[PDB]
Design a protein around this ligand. Structure first.
Ligand SMILES: [Mg+2]
Ligand SMILES: [Mg+2]
Ligand SMILES: [Mg+2]
Ligand SMILES: [Mg+2]
Ligand SMILES: [Mg+2]
Ligand SMILES: [Mg+2]
Ligand SMILES: [Mg+2]
Ligand SMILES: [Mg+2]
Ligand SMILES: [Mg+2]
Ligand SMILES: [Mg+2]
Ligand SMILES: [Mg+2]
Ligand SMILES: [Mg+2]
Ligand SMILES: [Mg+2]
Ligand SMILES: [Mg+2]
Ligand SMILES: [Mg+2]
Ligand SMILES: [Mg+2]
Ligand SMILES: [Mg+2]
Ligand SMILES: [Mg+2]
Ligand SMILES: [Mg+2]
Ligand SMILES: [Mg+2]
Ligand SMILES: [Mg+2]
Ligand SMILES: [Mg+2]
Ligand SMILES: [Mg+2]
Ligand SMILES: [Mg+2]
Ligand SMILES: [Mg+2]
Ligand SMILES: [Mg+2]
Ligand SMILES: [Mg+2]
Ligand SMILES: [Mg+2]
Ligand SMILES: [Mg+2]
Ligand SMILES: [Mg+2]
Ligand SMILES: [Mg+2]
Ligand SMILES: [Mg+2]
Ligand SMILES: [Mg+2]
Ligand SMILES: [Mg+2]
Ligand SMILES: [Mg+2]
Ligand SMILES: [Mg+2]
Ligand SMILES: [Mg+2]
Ligand SMILES: [Mg+2]
Ligand SMILES: [Mg+2]
Ligand SMILES: [Mg+2]
Lengths: 116, 101, 87, 70
RNA sequence: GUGGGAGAGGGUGGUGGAAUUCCCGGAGUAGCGGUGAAAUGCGCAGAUACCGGGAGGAACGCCGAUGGCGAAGGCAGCCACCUGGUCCACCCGUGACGCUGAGGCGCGAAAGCGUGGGGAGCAAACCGGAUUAGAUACCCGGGUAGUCCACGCCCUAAACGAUGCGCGCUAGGUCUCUGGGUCUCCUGGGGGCCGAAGCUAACGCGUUAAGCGCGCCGCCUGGGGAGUACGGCCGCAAGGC
């Protein structure tokens, strides 16, 4: 019970899963969702379709809070990141602006052998 | 003696008396390390690219000095010690290399 | 560093005749100035090895010019040595 | 898609305090542009770099920016 | 000598922002993670995702180059100090002062050793999950030495251009870094690519020789046994010559 009017959405997409958090204009979460939040379990989570269903799920969950406008912020490069943004556009939430915040360092930390 | 530029970025939330007190300390510090002040530009309030100590803006102070080189690091130490001094950069002077002639 | 004025004082001190920039004497004096500055720099900064090689090379040059001078005019060589305080 | 130096007047490349001109050589992000985009020379670009990095530490230039659109 | 220059050459002290980890707070549920698929693991003592604050260590994105510097190993955020080498111009000074260099001395990536710090991320060993006929591995989840700093040892390598150093001499073209010039271009000093003559078993090399010559050093004389044994020297040890 909020009635948050407008707000913003974070799409954090990896190759293994896509997960979408929706928040107030101060960044505090309202609802979230993910591939596994819906039926998916294994590799299937990080599918683009799951990303769609996650985007949507989070969006409906958000409109229960009476959301209208949303600012999309994208992190990660993963399968169905853009499908998340796409479902999120047609989600009936009016998408105000999209942006890419994906973190990269200035070369701080040694990655895993998997990542060299 | 060598020619240097002294960059100082301090609290934009400062009032007159206190700001001019930080400036008193700056003058007294410079002059205490042997630095002679050739010229000073005071830009003051400016919008930073990124926040500094939670602040979106900064108050800029630029100096050009001639001072003993052995003393420069300690000078900048003394400048930094102030709570209200957010940033200090001392730079050896350079002839203004131009381009697009 | 060694400024112009210092270098010049050393030269006008060690020149054989006015205007002599390059005689063995002046050369050895200058070498010695640099050698002392460097050896001083290496007292602290014991860990700067590249600079040290620099100093090895300077000492090598000095030794060669001195070897030459002694071979040539032993008197000027004694004079140089005592004046500088080498060997 | 003209090069950055191409549109400008004579300007001190060594001056870290001039934001108006330096902002031209950054990206949409805070990335310092490639030579092909800045149209500078080896030595030029080399000095510009240090100048920009100076300006950043001073607080007048971005290290990084958010990428809009996408 | 004088006057200019470029540079991750070195040493000391500072300092900057991104990211990871952890801690504190807010908001917020039911999963997160991970793979070829999974599982271990983590999460209702509230994780993942998100915002704010803090602590800490390590490394410096773009610029970045087929680039630069260094004798080599190697060296890249920024700032100051301390300091090495080197190039060009002027043609000013000394007057063969030169080259090479057995031995000696110094330097010497990583790993490794000693004492004391430090410890975020990574991670031999190890402990688990999978895969497999088995899996002592590859893949996944943890994780200690170590990785980092100081001082002291160790002396190795595909320490590679697999090409010792210096000097002279033998077409050019094209790209490039950095000086000077009367700045189209010429002229030095580096880095590349094609190529004259020539060399080479061939591949290829060719003014950055593997060409033509001179000087000096190191080194080789079939494979395995074997970089072993023995001796000596060095080393705390591993071990090295
Ligand atoms: Mg998955
Ligand atoms: Mg302060
Ligand atoms: Mg000179
Ligand atoms: Mg220097
Ligand atoms: Mg350096
Ligand atoms: Mg350094
Ligand atoms: Mg918490
Ligand atoms: Mg549990
Ligand atoms: Mg439990
Ligand atoms: Mg800690
Ligand atoms: Mg690159
Ligand atoms: Mg070189
Ligand atoms: Mg120098
Ligand atoms: Mg002459
Ligand atoms: Mg004569
Ligand atoms: Mg030799
Ligand atoms: Mg070693
Ligand atoms: Mg090591
Ligand atoms: Mg140790
Ligand atoms: Mg592992
Ligand atoms: Mg196992
Ligand atoms: Mg098994
Ligand atoms: Mg791990
Ligand atoms: Mg131990
Ligand atoms: Mg060999
Ligand atoms: Mg030979
Ligand atoms: Mg030759
Ligand atoms: Mg020119
Ligand atoms: Mg050339
Ligand atoms: Mg050529
Ligand atoms: Mg060829
Ligand atoms: Mg030649
Ligand atoms: Mg040969
Ligand atoms: Mg035999
Ligand atoms: Mg044999
Ligand atoms: Mg062996
Ligand atoms: Mg024997
Ligand atoms: Mg033995
Ligand atoms: Mg023994
Ligand atoms: Mg061995």
């Amino acid at each position: 019970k909020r009635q948050v009017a407008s707000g913003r959405a974070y799409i954090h997409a990896s190759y293994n899963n896509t997960i979408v958090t929706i928040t107030d204009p101060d960044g505090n979460p309202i609802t979230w969702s993910s591939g596994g939040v819906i039926g998916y379990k294994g590799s299937r989570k990080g599918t683009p379709y799951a990303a769609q269903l996650a985007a949507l799920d989070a969006a409906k969950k958000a409109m229960a809070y009476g959301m209208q406008s949303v600012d999309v912020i994208v992190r990660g490069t993963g399968a169905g990141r853009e499908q998340a943004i796409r479902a999120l556009q047609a989600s009936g939430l009016q998408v105000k602006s999209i942006v890419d915040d994906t973190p990269v360092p200035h070369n701080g930390c040694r990655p895993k052998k998997k990542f060299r | 003696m060598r020619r240097y530029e002294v960059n100082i970025v301090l609290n934009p939330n400062l009032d007159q008396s206190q700001l001019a007190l930080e400036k008193e300390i700056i003058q007294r510090a410079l002059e205490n390390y042997g630095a002679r002040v050739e010229k000073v530009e005071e830009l003051g309030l400016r919008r930073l690219a990124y926040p500094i100590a939670k602040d979106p803006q900064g108050y800029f102070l630029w100096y050009q000095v001639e001072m003993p080189e052995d003393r420069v690091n300690d000078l900048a130490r003394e400048l930094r010690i102030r709570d209200n001094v957010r940033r200090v950069m001392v730079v050896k002077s350079q002839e203004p290399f131009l381009a697009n002639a | 560093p060694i400024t112009k004025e210092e270098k010049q004082k050393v030269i006008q001190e060690f020149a054989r005749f006015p205007g002599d920039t390059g005689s063995t004497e002046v050369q050895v004096a200058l070498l010695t100035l640099r050698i002392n500055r460097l050896s001083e720099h290496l007292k602290v900064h014991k860990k700067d090895h590249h600079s040290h090689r620099g100093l090895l090379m300077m000492v090598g040059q000095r030794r060669r010019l001195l070897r030459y001078l002694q071979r040539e005019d032993p008197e000027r060589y004694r004079a140089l040595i005592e004046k500088l305080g080498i060997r | 898609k003209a090069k950055v130096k191409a549109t400008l007047g004579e300007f001190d490349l060594r001056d870290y305090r001039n934001v108006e001109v330096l902002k031209r050589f950054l990206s949409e992000t805070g990335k310092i542009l490639p030579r092909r985009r800045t149209g500078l020379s080896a030595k030029e670009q080399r000095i510009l770099a240090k100048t920009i990095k100076r300006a950043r530490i001073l607080g007048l230039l971005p290290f990084t920016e958010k990428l809009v659109r996408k």
